[PDB]
Each structure stands twice: as structure tokens, then as C-alpha cells.
Amino acid sequence: DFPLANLFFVPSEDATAFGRRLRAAAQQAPIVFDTAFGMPILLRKSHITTAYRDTATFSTRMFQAGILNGGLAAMQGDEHARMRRVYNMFFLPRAVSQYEERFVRPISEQVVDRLAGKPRVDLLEDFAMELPRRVIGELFGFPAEKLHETDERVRAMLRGLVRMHDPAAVAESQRAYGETLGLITEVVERESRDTSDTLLGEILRTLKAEHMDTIEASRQIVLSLILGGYETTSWLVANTIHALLAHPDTLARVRQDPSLLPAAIEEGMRWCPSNFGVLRMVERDVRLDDQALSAGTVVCLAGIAGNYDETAYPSPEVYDIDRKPLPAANVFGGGAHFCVGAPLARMEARVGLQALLARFPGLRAVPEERPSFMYGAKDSVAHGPDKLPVLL
């Protein structure tokens, strides 16, 4: 039994409130029970890094009861490493740079172009959501407005991958995936043809060459590009935008020198993380210092609690793109499951923000309307703003 804490479901106009809450809780106890979120939360750095590394004690098996069964995240040990190698190939530095020139740079120019002719826009819906959606489109050879229509189902899918102790959340997730399976099957069938010229077509050929091209594997490839490449990446872009908007002098520096964008992106992941960490299944009784966890417990590794550890990052409430070494990205997880798509997400954030800042030198937040930040923004599983109104 752990002390109670209320870390997740608390709204604030301060983007730092989430990180500050987690840090303040971590100073008081290593492990807390977040009643509204509904599970124990590991907050102490030593416990978290141990958990990420000891996959035999802290597994991803809970994923086998839900729509990710048969995907990469649900695999363990040797099965996992072999398929992981195959996913890794499509996010290598060279591959990502081809995506940048062919797909993401031009698309970014087009998304930013359609914001002009409006004195004010919501950069959340019109930019952070729109750009990753359209990238996943071009990787599929498939229209982005068709993905736009899956939004309620995409977030329904994701919510059942987080609050897995909730039977209703899990069942709605399975339902939403079932309602998306026709579309998934359409994309797979079309891009499995020799006539296929898309990246997704490249991917399905590689799976076949390793004799891994089951219906299930091909569906989970597509599913992860939707859940990760579209919805999750959106909140990274959105939180990076906000951090700059909320720091006009830094925004100006970054516009004048775009080579600062990677640091701005990493610092934004520290200062305003869009994800908290990961979920794990405790597979055997384990003692963490004087804490005990029972086998069968699903826990949250809230690695972003270290984002506000002032011993690592002094004045952690300050957005400082000049921190060196750059803060460790905890929003991508840890250990062998560490996000394989991270290189694409980082590149989309850099290229999109570069086009946005170059096209609108006068860009600024709407002074009256402050965003509200919370975990679960617009029914997502991200910590992010409810809106990003700007003046162009």
C-alpha cells in the first residue's frame, strides 16, 4: 500500500504543473497510488531505470490482452529483438533523410501555406494535428482526410492501451480497432501489390523477405504508424510550439537560427512532456529498496518525473534550449522497447516548426486565451494543450 497522489488529472494553464507535481511527489515517496488514473506510479529514478532494463520482472505482457497483441510492443525476448531489427531499418538516419526531402519538407510547406489568409488560427488542429496526419498519408499512398475520420477511434484505441485495468476502456479500444480494420485491410491489400510505390509497400516487401508477412504482422505495422506516427507525434509538435510561443525571445532566436530546433525540441520534451512514460506488468514479487510490488500488478513508470529533478536540470521550470548535455528524452520510454519511431517524430517536429517559423515571422500566442494543459487533453492519452490560438 502506497500513499495517494493526484498527479495526472489536474488541469493548469502552466505547462510545467504536471512535471512539478510529479517531482514534488517523487521527493515525498518513491511509489504512489494515483486514484483517478487508477494504478501505482513509480517515480524514483533508480526504480524506473531498473524496471526498464529487467524486462524479465517488468514486462509488456499486458499488451497481449488488447489490440496490440501480435504487434512489436507485445513481443518479448528473442521474438521482440528479431522484429525490432526489422522496424529499426525504416527509421535509420539515411532513410529518415529521404523521408524529409521527398515527403515531410514539401508537406510542411503545404500545411503552413494554408494557414495564411487567416489572422488567427488554432495551431493544435490546423498544424500539430494536420502535418503528421498528412505524412502518414504519403507513407500509405492513402488520403489524409480518411485518417482524419478515424480520430475518435484512434483515441479510443489508445485509451485502452493505457488504463488497461479498466474493462470498458479496453473493450472500447477493441471496438474502435474493429471499426478501423476495414480501412487497415484496404491499405494493406493495396500496398501489398507489385504496383506499390509507397514506403508502406517497401515495408510489406521486407516482412515477406523474412517470411514474417502474416495478416497480423502487416496490420500491426499499419496500426503503429497510425497510433504513433499520427496521433502521438501531434502532441510533440503541439507542446514544442507552445514552449516557443510561451518564450517569445527563444522563439525569435530559433527563427533567426533554425539549427537550434533540435535542442528546442529536446528541451521541450523535458519542460512540457507529451507522454509520461510506459506501463509494465510486474511478473514476480519484487522489492525496490523498502517498497514491495506484487506479481500481477500493472504499474506506470513515470520516467518524466526526472524531467523536473533539479539535481539533474537546475531551475527545471525554466525552458532553456541551451541546456547541455541535452536532457534525456524520457517521453520515448527506455530499455529495449524505447520508441522505434522516435527519429521520425523528431524529424517531423524539426521540419514542421522550421516551415512554420520561416513563413510567419510575426507569429505570437493570442494574449487573452491561455491554453489549458492536462493529461487526457481532448480525450487523448497525452499531456498537452486544449488549444494553441496564435496571431499570424
Amino acid at 57: T
Work out whether strand 4-5 and strand 286-288 pair parallel, antiparallel, or are unpaired: unpaired
- Give me the amino acid identity at 283: E
Q: Are 2 and 31 in contact (CB under 8 A)?
A: yes
Task: Tell whether residue 347 is a contact of ligand HEM (CB under 6 A).
Answer: no
Q: Which stretch binds ligand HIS (CB under 6 A): 205-213, 221-229, 248-256, 358-366?
A: 221-229
Which amino acid type is present at position 128?
A
Cα separation, 254 vs 103, in Å, equals 23
Please give the full DSSP string across 358-387, using - where no structure is assigned.
HH-TT-EE-SS-PPPEEETGGG-SSEEES-
| The binder of ligand HEM chosen from 16, 59, 218, 224 (CB under 6 A) | 224
- Using rule CB under 6 A, residue 160 touches ligand HEM: no
- Of the candidates 227, 237, 363, 365, which one interacts with ligand HIS according to CB under 6 A? 227
State the nearest-atom distance from the C-beta of 131 to ligand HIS, in Å: 17
Window contacting ligand HEM (CB under 6 A); options: 35-43, 249-257, 335-343, 370-378: 335-343
334 marked among binding-site residues: yes
| Least distance from ligand HEM to the Cβ atom of residue 79, Å | 11
Which partner, ligand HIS, ligand HEM, none, binds residue 158 by CB below 5 to 8 Å per kind?
ligand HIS
Give yes or no for residue 306 binding ligand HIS (CB under 6 A).
Answer: no
Per-residue b or e along 97-120, where b marks 16 or more CB atoms closer than 10 Å to that residue's CB: eebbeebbeebbeebbeebeeeee
Residues 239-278 that bind ligand HEM (CB under 6 A): 274-275, 278
Amino acid at the residue 190: R
- Our finding on whether 173 is near ligand HEM (CB under 6 A) is no
Smallest gap from Cβ 227 to ligand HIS, in A, equals 3
Region near ligand HIS per CB under 6 A, out of 50-58, 227-235, 263-271, 354-362: 227-235
Q: Is 164 one of the binding residues for ligand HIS (CB under 6 A)? A: no
Count of other CB atoms within 10 angstroms of residue 50: 17
Q: Which stretch binds ligand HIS (CB under 6 A): 31-39, 101-109, 211-219, 226-234?
A: 226-234
**Backbone break loci in the chain, preceding residues, C–N > 2.5 A:** none
Residue 272 annotated as lining a ligand binding site:
no
Q: Is 239 in the site for ligand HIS (CB under 6 A)?
A: no
Residue 351 within binding range of ligand HEM, rule CB under 6 A: no
Is residue 334 within 8 A of residue 303, CB to CB? The reply is: yes
Whole-angstrom distance, CA of residue 216 vs CA of residue 43? 35
- Closest distance to ligand HEM from the beta carbon of 117 (Å): 29
Distance CA 161, CA 381 (A): 9
Beta strands in 203-355 (DSSP E): 278-282, 286-288, 291-293, 298-301
For ligand HEM, the closer CB: 264 or 278 = 278
In the DSSP assignment, the letter for residue 337 is G
CB 233 within 8 Å of CB 132 = yes
| Cell 509488456, residue located | 60
Cα dihedral: 117, 102, 93, 54 (round 10): 70
Does 280 carry a binding-site annotation? yes
Output 129 or 344, the one with its CB closest to ligand HEM: 344
> Is residue 160 within 8 Å of residue 172, measured between CB atoms?
yes
243 forms part of the interface with ligand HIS (CB under 6 A): no
Smallest distance from the beta carbon of 116 to ligand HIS, in angstroms? 32
Which residues form the interface with ligand HEM (CB under 6 A)?
60, 72-73, 84, 87, 224-225, 228-229, 232-233, 236, 274-275, 278, 331-333, 337, 339-341, 344-345
Q: Which residues bind ligand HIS (CB under 6 A)?
A: 73, 158, 161, 224, 227-228, 232, 339
Known binding-site residues for heme b equal 80, 84, 280, 334, 337, 339
Task: Please report, in range form, the residues annotated as the binding site.
Answer: 80, 84, 280, 334, 337, 339
